[model samples]
Target chain A: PLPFFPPLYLGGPEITTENCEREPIHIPGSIQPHGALLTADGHSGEVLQMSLNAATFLGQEPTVLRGQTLAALLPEQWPALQAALPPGCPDALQYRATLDWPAAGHLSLTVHRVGELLILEFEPTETGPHALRNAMFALESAPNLRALAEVATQTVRELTGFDRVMLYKFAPDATGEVIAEARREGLHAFLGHRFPASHIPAQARALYTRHLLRLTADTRAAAVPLDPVLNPQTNAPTPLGGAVLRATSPMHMQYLRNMGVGSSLSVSVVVGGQLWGLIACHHQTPYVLPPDLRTTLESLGRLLSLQVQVKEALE
Target chain B: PLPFFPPLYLGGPEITTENCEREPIHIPGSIQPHGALLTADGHSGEVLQMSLNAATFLGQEPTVLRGQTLAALLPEQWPALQAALPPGCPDALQYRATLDWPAAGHLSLTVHRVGELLILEFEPTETGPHALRNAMFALESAPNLRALAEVATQTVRELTGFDRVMLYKFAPDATGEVIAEARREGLHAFLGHRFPASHIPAQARALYTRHLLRLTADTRAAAVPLDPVLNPQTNAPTPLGGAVLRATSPMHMQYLRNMGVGSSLSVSVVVGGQLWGLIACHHQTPYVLPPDLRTTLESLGRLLSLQVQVKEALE
Candidate 1:
């Protein structure tokens, strides 16, 4: 259900979820176009399920990878993968060695356990230590919340090279207000627009608290569903709660289409372990952020969380 | 998992919990001796289980309350209870209202829903507005993190009348070092002692983040088990994750006993939504902190959290 927008509100369209909040976004059953996922049996290391685009990154089709041992696909890092298998779900993503795939150059491998499956995600790694250092310096130098927000939007826009980046702060009621924005020329400014809480449902907020970053490389691209959808061992759908490539909800994709945005990324700004707000970036064409850049942006988010604490106290 | 103690370490006992880290402290299946708890079916509002001390506060035996509708227990405020039911597991305690029970003079009712059960806890309220104001003033006037911790320990010691109070700061590894303390003359000084991370298990640490405060009035006292041991609907143990009266883990009780503590209280100091440290208090005799005093101490913990952030930034 859509709530009445205040007279001063001038956002693109009134976003409404109605009953869609009940949708399990964490187990969205698909993934965005830019990356691929592979899940294996934790104990036996046998491939259980994988994204349809596995060939793009793993150099093998999903059908060919099914029921195969992890050692067959990643021979060099089999021992590392086996050692990193958690007894259960890990609190954060475990970074494995970089996979130098013949087809995908060098992609960082990250692994985490969800239930009985070990999920692995692979994405291109960007070399950006210098850029990250500069961004951190700029973020640390900003003295107050307002200045920090301004620098944050600008820094993220430069790091990701997105067409537009906005620092959206959430109110007590969960509605988001775009507090700061950095955009390319000819783009409409959304610096003062407010979107209702329904735009980002409770489940989505919970996911942001854990995952911290989410991206849709191309809104128009169809989500690649996992082949052999269910884990053979468990005889149930493989849970994707911790997968980096967990797909965007169809409803959220529709919302982006309505706004004329082709690609989007959101970095969570958490305070005291709770979702405080988000740094939302949008682009007019398909965009894929490198893994290292995403990691750097996550660090910026942590720094902003600290600055927010200090700013609140000073005020 | 015990890390080596630094040169300045000088605490009473080495607190440890080697194999108990995986213990489900959140669903301890029992309650402390001081307060009472009630679990009701979330949909039908029928009472499922209650702590042994329910009769002391509710003026009815657990048997009489079981299977009865919530309206039968508090006819006048049934609507309020219904309105407070969370859509899902709430991250923190939801305060209801102060009810003047016929048997128990004045008590505060707090509610939280976990799965199919709605839990309600009633604890006697203690009057302390003036004390809270004074504590607030002292905490706000502190110059730095160390000073704030010093004031926090002293203030809480005075408010709760505990024999000893220590502000324990956690390292990045989760091990704790006592940074500040206020204690009786005969007590051993623990100003620089380090405690292994095992002393507080991962689940317990997670609980501290949500509950913020925990207490054991008498470590030697037996934990009162819920009367109807399992939920009627699910035939499973009634979840007490959100119950204020939830009992402390036996391992933690043993650790406290080893420290020669008869009573204990711990208030969490959170910074950037993570457990920064704790204001731990110990007494040589059984001591139950009044509800209002507990509320005041929680406020002090919040103030200390903010000051810690400012102090970190300044440093």
Candidate 2:
């Protein structure tokens, strides 16, 4: 087969205002630099494509790693990791193992399944809060939408150390307004600020409905492209929808820069079956979320969505 | 170090009316022949003790099976099975895989973890319903406890082909009342029949709290004792509290005989940390529940318990 990854070729189509809605951000051929990614053939588990930073993060060159089955690559960890994967890799990234990689002291190994590929994501592990159950109690005690929004913003702000947190809620017109806010000392607030529906292209909103959350450590961080742009197994760009390390769309990165943000996180608040809005957070400094905290945020987002769903049903 | 299997030793201390409440039914040293049971050292996965029918069911002699690691005994199925076992086997038995055993055409493999040992259970696979989600929808759509009980009994009866199923509920004083039932057209009914507190001893109730369900394929089928009659690691009876094929107590067997019950299944209805009742099922002839259906019954029992729990809260 011909060399599929052309020199300097990045995955994903270019998005302009006219084509943004049609762009497939989920199949972005690159990822954020804080973590590295690898996709292996679903059944054989032979590495199909890997990020260029594999050597820097895993101490193994991507060229050497590409042909080895995961079971052969990490002989000790694969059985446990493969078994840990749900019968099918569910949409959410499940925390499986922490690898003691030579290049990265402790890398949290998270994995998900996408069609014929098993996607692996590795980020440096960090310590975080253990009072996640208490977080649920607060959500449960939330008596109304306003109270729920306030508690949602504050809890995530406290858990994530984000400079500003906002509860964005969509209006019937598809536009959204930041209805609630929590922020660190002296941060400018986005509370009550409205954004046009076009701000989040329809395609992006669809992903939020399915993936639950997305994170960006640094708006300006360069994306590390997958070495072989095409999956040897599929002969197409490896689909990274719901991938934890999937690179942010250039437009979204630019949008964050316009807001003077250095890092950000967006946990989708889905209610009923549609994308309701987000528990959106922004940080002035680079802010990478630990694997554990992301899980907590994902669950918190779901609970908050359920609360919103229940409140509307009653009223 | 002496051979723990003394001649004619059938595990468990004898129980009379005075000692029944304290008798440890969980450590019954034998199992029903419908499925073969094997317990292995948790860390090594080495077979520690196996049912005497191992040769008949697994096509392996019990004496030889006792020394082999499960990974070696069923090499093709073990990795998938071991990986499938939750990191720490949670309390419930999870359906893992179907093995094409030499003796049995197809065997549904199920497993659970108990302290330092991994327990494996295998029963002949059978055809069954796949609309479990619809079953859940029926439970969710239930408007009252009566409706929930009716759905629970009927769903289990249809799934397991049991001749009779009754919602036997606990009273404040520990006695039980058969509140609802679904039996074959020609069978006599037991709905509203009350039983004395002595019917189920205290120890039995405690096991019900942990293991969601139990099945006795045939009350008259002789118990197949573990070859060694002791866990080499624990130096005692292999604990079988939640075991699917754990041999029923002789007293219970005789009690079933008195009722002319040839086989039975009981699913615990637990609410607020205690077992509130049972989804009791019986057949006039022998019956075996497949692994898949037991999982369904366990979940149904939980859903019914929650509905009852909700009903009490509302009133």
Candidate 3:
């Protein structure tokens, strides 16, 4: 028999789970932090800070090691990020910076600012395609409406490794049409096409209005609610049953089926407390997600929601 | 036949169309000058002064006539307006007051200010419901968004005599739902129901996105563009079409038809470069707007567009 061996980086990692019922378990510390935190100034719509946490910098404090300004922090070669910062935002906003740190090797910086204080968390830039894609999405702010749709579609393409990405903006009459399309190398364009309006009805829009993020992994696999009674009226609420087996709209399910989408994810783009649009991710091949990745994507969706909300409110 | 009588108060009451066309019209010495200037401040968002052209005085040379801050001009109100001013705006701005001192005892006042200069235009406060509504919309020193929307809705309702008025919030997806609704008595509650999103297709949304303001006298009326090209690319820029016929989706037209609406007028609510929503006015009875009224509404829409744009840009 082969000798039993613990995996590398396993040293009895401590974990704390809020609202979790199970007893505390000691597990190996091999899992890495693959997430970011973004905050902004309420009045100015300025991005204050971004906190990048990964395996190497999991426990380290996110601080601005280089000068606060993008120009000061990144090399002169990075002009795209520098130009994206709006003049009205006079302060450094949350952005992702990929740079070669002399001591840390090629790293991805999660940047955010709180007032004058700036936070930059560094992680290996090559954390594979998913992480890289997330950084890219966070970095591109999209200065205009068309640009916003484009960036969101591009991000979806990167995340699902899909052949095409399309953004559908809805009309007041419950009809929807493709507003922006970003396709992979071999995909055809869906930009100017008019899809049926019944794809999202009034009831469906209301259902998703409160929930900014949603994901359907494989149209045939089933769309179950991650949480029922997402907001409870009382404290110490019971764990709602059927959290993962709630039925989805038959119309939407059928629509996706007809469109040949094996898996899909969509997040609401709400502006000024109204449903503005949706950031939809689609995959042609059947796909399913583990719980962790789903949580990260949902959190990212929330961050984007805040930015869209700010843009609307200021108007 | 009864003797022809001329109306009182006109400088020349018996002036005929032919005579007016033949000679330059002149007013008697009794009529007060109409082109006087007025001033108001930036921070307080209120009207302030009425100058000599401001002839009929509401108060002293520089008065806090229109609910402005007196701290800068007068030691008292200045503190109030300064405290109330939105952040980033000036602590004090100029105030112009305008009033109407007509021979017929119609008395009114309006204050205007661009930066430091103030122009006061005197008129009668009872400029009729239409004029008063227009004045409310024209007032530059609106306190906030709620006030602005309220004024806009009131103005449209009065102008169109609509039974139900709504400010529809469009999603980034081209779908829109009614976010704000105002109505006269006997109107049903259409406030919270999500308007079906299917009315505006992607193509339709794109059309509206390119064209800012549209007005229709009746949905059933033949829809024609005032200018064939809604957007023209040229060396010398052309303004948007002056006024066009009422044209809309058949379904939308049908829906309006069901609601006893023969005409619908919509002004795009643009926030930043994005189309935020629309100010929709519906007339239950068939009505044709005069050229002057159409021009006035168009001007009002332009001002609203600028305000919304500036609000987003500043943010």
Give the Cα error of residue B37 in candidate 1, in Å: 70
Error of 3 at A38 (Å): 32
- Across A67-145, the per-residue lDDT of candidate 1 in tens digits comes to 8997877788777767756565353545356767565368888777776678888877642333443354345446778
**TM-scores for every candidate against the unseen true structure:** 0.49, 0.53, 0.28
Is 1 or 3 the stronger prediction by lDDT?
Answer: 1
Q: Quick one: best TM-score, which candidate?
A: 2
Tell me the tens digit of each residue's lDDT in model 3 across B1-315: 122222222232443432322111111111122222233445543443333333343333323343454344345334533443334432112121222343544433222222332223343432122232224323323455545566666666766566666767776665677755678888776665565455544434444554555555565654322121111122111121211322333445566788788767777665444667777777777665443344345444544554544444444
Q: What 10-residue stretch in candidate 1 chain B is worst by lDDT?
A: B3-12
Task: Indicate the worst ten consecutive residues by lDDT in candidate 2 chain B.
Answer: B1-10
Q: Number of clashes in model 3?
A: 69
lDDT of 1 by residue, B1-315 (tens): 232222111222333445565565666567887778988877778888888888988888988988899887777667766765545635353536678866536887777777777888888765133344335434544677788778888877777778999999999999999999999888889998999987876777877876777888899989888876667778656656566678887778888999899999888888766999999999998887766566556655655676677667666
lDDT of 3: 0.44
Chain A TM-score for predicted structure 3:
0.48
Ten residues in sequence with the least summed lDDT for candidate 3 chain A: A23-32
Off by over 4 Å in 2: A1-14, A84-89, A93-95, A127-130, B1-315
**Per-residue lDDT value at B102 in model 2:** 61
Off by over 4 Å in 3: A1-141, A222-245, A306-315, B1-315
Q: Per-residue error at A75 for model 1, in Å?
A: 2.7
